[PDB]
């Protein structure tokens, strides 16, 4: 099945998470850039031209952590002690409801890995755009869940927290602002 880039999904995701659309497209490209310039689209690197572009791996890693945490959410019954990011969303659910999470929640992986590898070895810019669009599509699919009602809040909060954590992690690799260098207890900082 042919794929084409859809910037509308990124626009919608930015609207949902209140961040600028340039923040989403800068995933994996925030290094050596202040967040103020990132959110305004200033200094955006040109699209990748080789399969050895670290941006492709970075966006693939973001999609991977999203999918990993989603699968962790869909299999809480397996983990005797579920992960903290998932634990706080299943404290008010019964064992029957936790077991029902596997079948209720849709699988959003689709064919991401094979398509991404094919694009990476074929079209790096298409690979990056596809990874970002896939992340946005997965977030929208998790966000636009209406049935059953007892899972809508869970999936919505999980998707919001997951994408916010992803953006923050990509933000945590950007240029730091002014701060107290002596916050690390020591006489010197290098």
Partner 1 sequence: MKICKACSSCMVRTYVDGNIIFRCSCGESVQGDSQNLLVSSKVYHTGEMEDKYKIFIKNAPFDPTNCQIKKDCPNCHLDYLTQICIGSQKIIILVCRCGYMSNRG
Partner 2 sequence: AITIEINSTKFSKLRIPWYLIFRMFGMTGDDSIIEQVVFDLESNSLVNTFMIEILEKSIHVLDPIFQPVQHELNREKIIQFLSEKVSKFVSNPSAYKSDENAVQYLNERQLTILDKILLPHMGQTADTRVRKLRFLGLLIHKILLVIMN
Partner 3 sequence: IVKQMFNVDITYKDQRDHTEIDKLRESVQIQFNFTDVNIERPQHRNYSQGNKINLLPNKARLCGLSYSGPVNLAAEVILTAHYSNGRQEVKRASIPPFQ
Binding site for partner 2 (CB under 8 A): 28, 31-32, 51-54, 56-58, 60-61, 64-65, 68, 113, 169-181, 183-186, 188-190
Q: Which does 16 bind (CB under 5 to 8 A by kind): partner 1, partner 3, partner 2, none?
A: none
79 binds partner 1 (CB under 8 A): yes
Identify any residues that bridge with 34 across adjacent strands, giving them in sequence order. Answer: 175
Minimum CB–partner distance for residue 94 and partner 2 (Å): 28
Q: Where are the beta strands (DSSP E) in 95-181?
A: none
Question: Alpha-carbon Rg of the chain, whole angstroms?
Answer: 18
Task: Rule CB under 8 A: say whether 190 interacts with partner 3.
Answer: yes
3-state secondary structure of 175: strand
Of 75, 85, 156, 171, which one interacts with partner 1 (CB under 8 A)? 75
Report how many residues bind partner 1 under the rule CB under 8 A: 14
End-to-end CA distance of the chain: 52
Residues 6+ apart with CB under 8 A from 14: 20, 21, 23, 24
Q: Is the dihedral of CA 96, 90, 59, 16 positive or negative?
A: positive
Residue 182 lies near partner 3 (rule: CB under 8 A): yes
Binding site for partner 1 (CB under 8 A): 64, 67-68, 70-72, 74-76, 78-79, 107, 109, 113
């Amino acid at each position: 099945e042919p794929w084409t880039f859809d910037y509308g999904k990124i626009i919608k995701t930015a609207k949902i998470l209140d961040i600028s659309p340039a923040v989403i497209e800068a995933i994996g490209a925030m290094e050596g850039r202040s967040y103020a310039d990132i959110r305004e689209g200033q200094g955006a690197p040109p699209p990748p031209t080789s399969m050895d572009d670290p941006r492709l791996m970075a966006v693939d890693s973001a999609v991977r952590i999203f999918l990993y945490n989603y699968n962790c959410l869909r299999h809480v019954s397996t983990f005797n002690k579920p992960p903290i990011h998932v634990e706080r969303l299943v404290k008010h659910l019964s064992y029957e409801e936790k077991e029902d999470l596997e079948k209720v929640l849709p699988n959003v992986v689709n064919e991401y890995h094979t398509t991404f590898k094919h694009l990476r070895v074929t079209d790096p810019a298409s690979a990056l755009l596809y990874s970002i669009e896939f992340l946005c599509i997965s977030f929208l699919t998790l966000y636009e869940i209406k049935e059953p009602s007892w899972v809508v809040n869970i999936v919505r909060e999980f998707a919001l927290t997951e994408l916010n954590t992803i953006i923050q992690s990509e933000k945590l690799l950007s240029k730091p602002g002014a701060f107290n260098f002596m916050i690390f207890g020591e006489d010197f900082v290098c």
